[PDB]
Amino acid sequence: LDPQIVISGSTAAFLAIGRFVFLGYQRREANFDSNSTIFATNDPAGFNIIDVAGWGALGHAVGFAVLAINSLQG
Amino acid sequence: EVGPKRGSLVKILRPESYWFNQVGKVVSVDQSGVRYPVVVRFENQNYAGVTTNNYALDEVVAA
Amino acid sequence: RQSWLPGSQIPAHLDTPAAQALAGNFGFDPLGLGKDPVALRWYQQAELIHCRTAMAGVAGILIPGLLTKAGALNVPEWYDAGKVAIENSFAPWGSLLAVQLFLCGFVEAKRWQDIRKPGSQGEPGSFLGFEASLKGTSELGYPGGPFDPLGLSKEADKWADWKLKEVKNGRLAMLAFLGFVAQKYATGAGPVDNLAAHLKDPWHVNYATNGVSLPFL
Amino acid sequence: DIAGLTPCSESKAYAKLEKKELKTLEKRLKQYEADSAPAVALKATMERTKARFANYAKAGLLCGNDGLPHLIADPGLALKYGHAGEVFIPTFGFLYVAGYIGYVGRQYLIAVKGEAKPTDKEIIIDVPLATKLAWQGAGWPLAAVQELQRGTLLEKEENITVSPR
Amino acid sequence: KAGNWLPGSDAPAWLPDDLPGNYGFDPLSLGKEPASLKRFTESEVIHGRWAMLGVAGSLAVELLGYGNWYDAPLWAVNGGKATWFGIEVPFDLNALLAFEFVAMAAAEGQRGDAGGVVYPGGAFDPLGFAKDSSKSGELKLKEIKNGRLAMVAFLGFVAQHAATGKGPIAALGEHLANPWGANFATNGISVPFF
Amino acid sequence: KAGNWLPGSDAPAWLPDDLPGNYGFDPLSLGKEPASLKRFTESEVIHGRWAMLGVAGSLAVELLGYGNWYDAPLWAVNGGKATWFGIEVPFDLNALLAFEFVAMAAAEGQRGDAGGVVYPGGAFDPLGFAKDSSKSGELKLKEIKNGRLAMVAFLGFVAQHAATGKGPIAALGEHLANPWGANFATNGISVPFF
């Protein structure tokens, strides 16, 4: 199993579902969750660097879990 | 004429009272402007052995 | 006023006009289980069901048993008929009991809903038009329609008598079945066998000589 | 059978314990006469021991590695292997007698609470009322279920005193 | 109302009359709160549709001859390949989880973002069988009734398999061959004292 | 009214006089309510027509030498092919249940959608035997009476078969040969003591 392909695909898939699917739900839940730094970005949907890091982290965890399970040969 | 009728049964609404939520007989109601004009007698004595107490007009309800 | 104990104080809950309308009212309630009118009504329904079930069972035990004594039938004993019947049967006892439980649960649930609300089973458009006949009479536990096809309940003059013949007989049947159990645990034979054994010598064949009913003697 | 135990009728330690008890009783009996009171009492004790061991083995009890009977408290195992007489039937028997006592006492308290001096009836028991309630308490489960269904078994929260929190 | 689940019993006041499949069945009073009842309606419709598709697929595979519903994912556990309608599928279990996860996440995310829509219409109804809301009430009753029946059927599939080990079609043929001798009361699993 | 089932008894007030086959027979008061009487009337006419078809089919199949009514579906129990009038049919039991189910479901659905119609007419009466409503009441009485007789005949067919084992034509010949020696009292199950 190619590790690069699996990791890249999992990260891209989680970033895609975080930018085009669960972005509105997350924004609605984050605003209703009620010093800070405003991470303003030029993304038209408001997908900033923090969201990139969070979704990339989830994608990396999923990809490494898949690679680990496939490595176990079972 | 103010207050409950003499000899009637009332329920005590004072939270710190021993007879809270208990029924007692009305003995006499003072006609002046005292804070606690209603006199209530109870069948069961408290921890101090007393069977009567004074309550306000809003601290007793006809029950 | 017929009483179960001449001179005893009849309970007040059994002397009311509503309680006196029940069949077989003899003022017998020492434990006072019928003090509550709702409980009395529920127990009246239970007594009626017990009377009818006991009469059917005791008849099914006594008549085939009496015919077996002669050459009319060959039905085995009531305590052994289940095994004999299930041996040459098309279904095991478990499957048969499951089908029986479903079929009995349906009618018992309908009777229960009628007990909770009298005449509620006559809801239009609910039982393929047969709901009109599922409404009982003015007395709980005495329905008409499909039940009572001969229409013997329409005559009121004998109605009060008919109910008296149903409860009393039922009560007797309720005791009969009880005896059928006790005798089975004291003699090891059937009821007809016990009756014949007692008729042969009553002064020596009874419950005072079985060695079980009198362990202190 | 259950929990790796063996029936007492087949346990070797059970028979060994029976032999040990009979042996010590016989040893004590060897010092007396043959037609005296201690001899008769010891023989009666020996017969009681033999009858007890035979009755416990006949009941189908399960014995452990120590040769002593073990009780089964699980209703499923007791009803599946014929052990309902250990813990099930005595459970319902105790429940009936305990509820009997509690119901009779509650009925007596409710009956004497509507009198002039209920405390006097609490210290000096009214024997006729107590006897009548004791005899009428045989139908305590039916009466209790009826009281619970009518809502007269419990008292309202507004009629019970509580602390000021 | 659609009917009465208990002939002669009063219907609950919290169940609206215009609600499809309203038989007045709520003994535990779970739908008493209006907010909970609103979610329960769409949840029941979604469950009914999923169960209808699941039962239809479970029956179709056994009727066509490709095993039962339980033996279908047995290829991914011990060296096998998926076969749809007898045709080999060139996708392994690793690729199936990614495709299904992404597709279901997108579809269900859009459905959730809609705001609890039970009857979307439009693109989901190309034939326009429910263009007018007057006749849609009768068609919704059929959908909810078939959904409840399919939910019960799937529960029965799982229970009969866990109790005997055969598929729904195989259990039906066995029951047809011996009704009194092959049922839930004779499998030695359902009723332990029978 | 058509007559009196019990001479000397008064006819019930809930049975209309213009109803075909109204003999005043209702001791259980089943048709007391008007809503139940309509459904029961349509059900009785449908039952009579189906019973007439069934009895005619059983009599014809046993009179033509093609077995009795009980042995007709035996070909699908031990392996065989159905034969109609001596001509083989290649339809197995599986294809028969599906086609019959679809055809009967469509026909019965169309019949029930009319709101419980007992006498449709038109396409069902191409010969126009009941064009006038004056003679319609007389023919309706004949139809309901023949249907009741057919229902009784079918019940007799089933009961006599379960009691003896032979078919209706074979039972009639046996009774004609020995009337006193062959009847319901000599089967061994109707009368237990004798």
Curated annotation (Swiss-Prot), chain A:
Membrane topology label: Multi-pass membrane protein
Keyword tags: Chloroplast, Membrane, Photosynthesis, Photosystem I, Plastid, Thylakoid, Transit peptide, Transmembrane, Transmembrane helix
Localization in the cell: Plastid, Chloroplast thylakoid membrane
Biological processes annotated in GO: photosynthesis
Function, in words: Not yet known.
Positions of transmembrane segments: 5-25, 49-69
Residues of the full protein shown: 32 to 122 of 126
Principal cellular location given in the protein's record: plastid
Keyword Membrane appears in the UniProt entry: yes
Protein name listed in UniProt: Photosystem I reaction center subunit V, chloroplastic
GO cellular component, one term: photosystem I
Family: Belongs to the PsaG/PsaK family.
Swiss-Prot record, chain B:
Keywords: Chloroplast, Membrane, Photosynthesis, Photosystem I, Plastid, Thylakoid, Transit peptide
Protein origin, superkingdom: Eukaryota
Entry annotated with the keyword Transit peptide: yes
Bilayer topology term: Peripheral membrane protein
GO biological process, one term: photosynthesis
Places the protein is found: Plastid, Chloroplast thylakoid membrane
Keyword Manganese applies: no
A GO cellular component entry from the record: photosystem I reaction center
Main location: plastid
Subunit-level organization: Interacts with ALB3.1, which is essential for its insertion into thylakoid membrane.
The family this protein is said to belong to: Belongs to the PsaE family.
Function statement: Stabilizes the interaction between PsaC and the PSI core, assists the docking of the ferredoxin to PSI and interacts with ferredoxin-NADP oxidoreductase.
Protein name, per record: Photosystem I reaction center subunit IV, chloroplastic
Species, as recorded: Chlamydomonas reinhardtii (Chlamydomonas smithii)
Lineage: Eukaryota, Viridiplantae, Chlorophyta, core chlorophytes, Chlorophyceae
Name of the encoding gene: PSAE
Full protein stretch here: 34 to 96 of 97
Swiss-Prot record, chain D:
Keyword Transit peptide recorded: yes
Any one GO BP annotation for this protein: photosynthesis
Annotated Gene Ontology cellular component terms: chloroplast thylakoid lumen; photosystem I reaction center
Location(s) in or outside the cell: Plastid, Chloroplast thylakoid lumen
Signal peptide residues on this chain, from the entry's feature table: none
Keywords, alphabetical: Chloroplast, Photosynthesis, Photosystem I, Plastid, Thylakoid, Transit peptide
Principal cellular location given in the protein's record: plastid
The keyword Oxidoreductase is assigned to this record: no
Function: Probably participates in efficiency of electron transfer from plastocyanin to P700 (or cytochrome c553 in algae and cyanobacteria). This plastocyanin-docking protein contributes to the specific association of plastocyanin to PSI.
Family: Belongs to the PsaF family.
Protein name: Photosystem I reaction center subunit III, chloroplastic
Species this chain originates from: Chlamydomonas reinhardtii (Chlamydomonas smithii)
Lineage of origin: Eukaryota, Viridiplantae, Chlorophyta, core chlorophytes, Chlorophyceae
